[PDB]
Amino acid sequence: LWIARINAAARQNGISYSKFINGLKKASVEIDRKILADIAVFDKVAFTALVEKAKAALA
Amino acid sequence: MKVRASVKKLCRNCKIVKRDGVIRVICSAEPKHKQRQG
Amino acid sequence: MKTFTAKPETVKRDWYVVDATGKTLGRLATELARRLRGKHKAEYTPHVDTGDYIIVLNADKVAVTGNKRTDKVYYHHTGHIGGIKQATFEEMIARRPERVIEIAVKGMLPKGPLGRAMFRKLKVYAGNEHNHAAQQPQVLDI
Amino acid sequence: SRVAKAPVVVPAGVDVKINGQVITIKGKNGELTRTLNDAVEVKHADNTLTFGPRDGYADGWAQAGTARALLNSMVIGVTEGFTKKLQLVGVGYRAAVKGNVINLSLGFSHPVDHQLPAGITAECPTQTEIVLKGADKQVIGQVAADLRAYRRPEPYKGKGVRYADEVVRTKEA
Amino acid sequence: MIGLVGKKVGMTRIFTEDGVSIPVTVIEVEANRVTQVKDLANDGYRAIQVTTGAKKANRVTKPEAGHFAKAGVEAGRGLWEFRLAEGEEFTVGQSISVELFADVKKVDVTGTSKGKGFAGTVKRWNFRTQDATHGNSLSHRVPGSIGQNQTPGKVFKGKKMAGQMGNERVTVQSLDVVRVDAERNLLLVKGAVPGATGSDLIVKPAVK
RNA sequence: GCUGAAAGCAUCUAAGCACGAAACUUGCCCCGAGAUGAGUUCUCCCUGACCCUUUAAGGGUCCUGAAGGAACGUUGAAGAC
RNA sequence: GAUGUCGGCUCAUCACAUCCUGGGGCUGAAGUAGGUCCCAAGGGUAUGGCUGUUCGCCAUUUAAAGUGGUACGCGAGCUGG
RNA sequence: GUGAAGAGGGAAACAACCCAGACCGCCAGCUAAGGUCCCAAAGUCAUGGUUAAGUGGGAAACGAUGUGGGAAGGCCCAGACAGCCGAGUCGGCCUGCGCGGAAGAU
């Protein structure tokens, strides 16, 4: 369930789940999927910031 | 018409043609030479 | 903490309108099923319906590849001994154009009460007009 | 290829109009129109027409040859026209013309009446001879074949409707 | 074309001068009165509705009476409908008589057949009886076998069995029109038609 | 079978056009909106006062009882009931 | 610590490697009548003498008297040679 | 070697095949075989080729100008092949993927 929700949230900001996870690993962020899904539902500005971090790591 | 699995030319006036996915032999000299693969 | 779950009494839904002229049948059906189930929202929950309403226009101008227009066969059985029956894609388009999209989308949804409920939000027409202007749908590009 | 590489001359007294893939040829004998395939480009230089493949297709040359042959036939037709001849062989076989209908007696228990399409004319210089005139090669061919189908030449004596220049083989019992 | 509603009176015969006896059914056809016209704009098809006969006032309920009073005609014993063809027109309140069949040669007649009740297979489906002697044991009019073994292991749909027989709608086609009498409202046809004496009939021009 | 190239000829086929069977889909007869996707058309009937409370698709009291239906009786060429 | 086994009667349902009717190509196919192969499963497809027989032989009919699967279909449906 | 006397994941379902040996709890993380369009968790990923048969998603001897690659030949601007004048044309060899051969009982 957590994975499905994270995919849905990431595609609304412009990236796919696999790429998002790869970027977080390359940036050394260690937040797990339960917390990621909770933030996806309850706080969207913070989730957008996380997506930007991953994109910068991949760039 | 000759319906068989091995079809081939039988004289110098025979011709081979492909129609709608089938292989056929037509001849302008002998009606007995008309063949269809099947 | 406990993980969030949606509630059928407070979900929100929206109305979209789509045009099928020249689109590939299966690659349109996948998107329709996705958005009817609600896999594109962050609130998705397997046991609740969190989908949207979709109108489809021009169902008689949908496209297929290869030799399928004359070679794809639909089958069904009537329940009586010996009652097996068939039609081709061309025939189906000639007499019941909407069924072509309806059957394809129905095959891609979950099986059961909730899936039968999800199917009720799809409205397919054969021409270029509908009578749902009171709901104010928005244009969706697929 | 070789057929498509020879240009087609447009003599004096014929008008050529091109629009997308639709072509119209107008002369003294009438007017003809045709739509071409999506892999052929046609050009009207000064007094000639040329045909070529369009980049993006794998069978441009065959289509070009076909288009060349068709346009050549159209140009000949709008100025000279095409004619065909049919002959009857047998006892009691007869043909006649009235308006745009051919009446045939060919040994049946009823008469045969054939209604000519639009643009084809017929004449009967003799009770055992038919001549067709027109401007469309395919249409005239189809009309002749339909007339022949009523009674085909048989192999023991040769009776029936035949083309004028046709060789009919015979055999013994 | 349109047809008419009538009533079955009985059966008789007609003698001809050459010495032939034609058996006939006698149908009484009073005037049919038009109650409603249905068109494409308002209903989606083209038809007329008619009544015939008479009915006592204290058996007519208020809805029915209002429907009759809209058209402006007297109440009858029922309502029937007929489909229209291209170039056929009628108006509400108009009367149609049996002189409609003056030049028709053949008709089709429709009615409700006599009811036999619960019936066996011998009378309902023409089954054959088994032996009456030679050691038969309680199986004289019974149906026999009704299936096969473990394959398929069931009974197929549409099997022929005992049940209710009759009392349903039946049509008989292509009957010669023998006489049309307009001063007495009579139509005479050749042969038998479904129903019992006193029942309702629908008469139409023949479709084949 | 017609017209026609790839393959300067020929060729029913690759682009185009025409015929062709008791098999297929209709045309004939019967059922059919529980088709839960539960459709359409015509006609008819009902036009009073109060109270409480946790304030709502809320509970109760007096006055009122239409269109129509069911029940009972005499019964049918309808029927095991 | 039980799945009744031949033949007949009653009642059937499916396949196509087609007996009849329908549409075709070749013939050492003049006509009438035949031979061989391709397509087609809509409907149709005997009564008696002998024998427990299924088969088979014989008598007289028919457009024709198809070939197979279904616990060698069918005994909580009948018979018992 | 495994089952017998062995649970978990894959092969639709499937003791004996592939991965792997369950002391108890957790709404943490990494991988194996096998996978990433929707039923159903994850690439409608990137770059260069092949196939037109729904081949992929059942079968042989044998038959044919389907069409992709390779190494060598005969004739030809001193005029080749075809038909009735001007650039190509003939037939063998090895190899990749497709085509016919292909008829059954709710």
From Swiss-Prot, chain A:
State the name under which the record lists this protein.
Large ribosomal subunit protein bL20
Q: Which organism is it from?
A: Escherichia coli (strain K12)
Q: Which UniProt keywords apply?
A: Ribonucleoprotein, Ribosomal protein, RNA-binding, rRNA-binding
GO cellular component term of the entry, any: cytosolic large ribosomal subunit
| Superkingdom of source | Bacteria
Provide the family line.
Belongs to the bacterial ribosomal protein bL20 family.
Q: What does this protein do?
A: One of the primary rRNA binding proteins, it binds close to the 5'-end of the 23S rRNA. It is important during the early stages of 50S assembly.
GO terms for biological process? cytoplasmic translation; ribosomal large subunit assembly
Q: Name one GO molecular function term.
A: mRNA regulatory element binding translation repressor activity
- Note the subunit structure: Part of the 50S ribosomal subunit. Contacts L21.
Swiss-Prot record, chain B:
Which protein, by its recorded name, is this? Large ribosomal subunit protein bL36A
Assembly description: Part of the 50S ribosomal subunit.
Which HAMAP family does the protein's record reference? Ribosomal_bL36
Q: Give a short account of what the protein does.
A: One of the last ribosomal proteins to be assembled in the 50S subunit, it contacts a number of helices in the 23S rRNA, acting as molecular glue. The simultaneous presence of uL16 and bL36 probably triggers ObgE's GTPase activity and eventual dissociation from the mature 50S ribosomal subunit.
UniProt entry keywords in alphabetical sequence: Ribonucleoprotein, Ribosomal protein, RNA-binding, rRNA-binding
Task: Report the family membership.
Answer: Belongs to the bacterial ribosomal protein bL36 family.
Q: Which PROSITE patterns match?
A: RIBOSOMAL_L36
Recorded GO molecular functions are: rRNA binding; structural constituent of ribosome
- Species name: Escherichia coli (strain K12)
Task: Write down any Gene Ontology CC term.
Answer: cytosolic large ribosomal subunit
Fetch the InterPro entries from UniProt. Ribosomal_bL36, Ribosomal_bL36_sp
One of the GO biological process terms: cytoplasmic translation
UniProtKB/Swiss-Prot annotation, chain C:
Superkingdom of the organism of origin: Bacteria
Listed A to Z, the keywords are: Ribonucleoprotein, Ribosomal protein
Molecular functions per Gene Ontology: large ribosomal subunit rRNA binding; mRNA 5'-UTR binding; mRNA binding; structural constituent of ribosome; zinc ion binding
What SUPFAM superfamilies has UniProt attached to this entry? Ribosomal protein L13
Which GO terms of type biological process are on file?
Answer: cytoplasmic translation; negative regulation of translation
* Name the UniProt record assigns to this protein: Large ribosomal subunit protein uL13
Complexes and interactors? Part of the 50S ribosomal subunit.
Determine if Protease is one of this entry's keywords: no
Question: Which GO terms of the cellular component aspect does the record hold?
Answer: cytoplasm; cytosol; cytosolic large ribosomal subunit; ribosome
Q: Which HAMAP family match?
A: Ribosomal_uL13
Give the protein's function: This protein is one of the early assembly proteins of the 50S ribosomal subunit, although it is not seen to bind rRNA by itself. It is important during the early stages of 50S assembly.
Lipid metabolism as a keyword of this entry, yes or no, is no
Q: Which family does it belong to?
A: Belongs to the universal ribosomal protein uL13 family.
Curated annotation (Swiss-Prot), chain D:
| Sites of N6-acetyllysine modification | K43
> What InterPro entries does this protein map onto?
Ribosomal_uL6-like, Ribosomal_uL6-like_a/b-dom_sf, Ribosomal_uL6_a/b-dom, Ribosomal_uL6_bac-type, Ribosomal_uL6_CS
- Does the keyword rRNA-binding feature in the UniProt annotation? yes
Tell me which Pfam families the record gives: Ribosomal_L6
| GO cellular component entries | cytoplasm; cytosol; cytosolic large ribosomal subunit
A Gene Ontology molecular function term of the record: structural constituent of ribosome
**Transmembrane segment boundaries:** none
Keyword tags: Acetylation, Antibiotic resistance, Ribonucleoprotein, Ribosomal protein, RNA-binding, rRNA-binding
Any one GO biological process: ribosomal large subunit assembly
Q: What does this protein do?
A: This protein binds directly to at least 2 domains of the 23S ribosomal RNA, thus is important in its secondary structure. It is located near the subunit interface in the base of the L7/L12 stalk, and near the tRNA binding site of the peptidyltransferase center. Gentamicin-resistant mutations in this protein affect translation fidelity.
Q: How does it assemble?
A: Part of the 50S ribosomal subunit.
Q: What PANTHER family does the record tag this protein with?
A: 60S/50S RIBOSOMAL PROTEIN L6/L9 (PTHR11655), LARGE RIBOSOMAL SUBUNIT PROTEIN UL6M (PTHR11655:SF14)
Family membership? Belongs to the universal ribosomal protein uL6 family.
Q: Which HAMAP family match?
A: Ribosomal_uL6_B
Under what name is this protein listed?
A: Large ribosomal subunit protein uL6
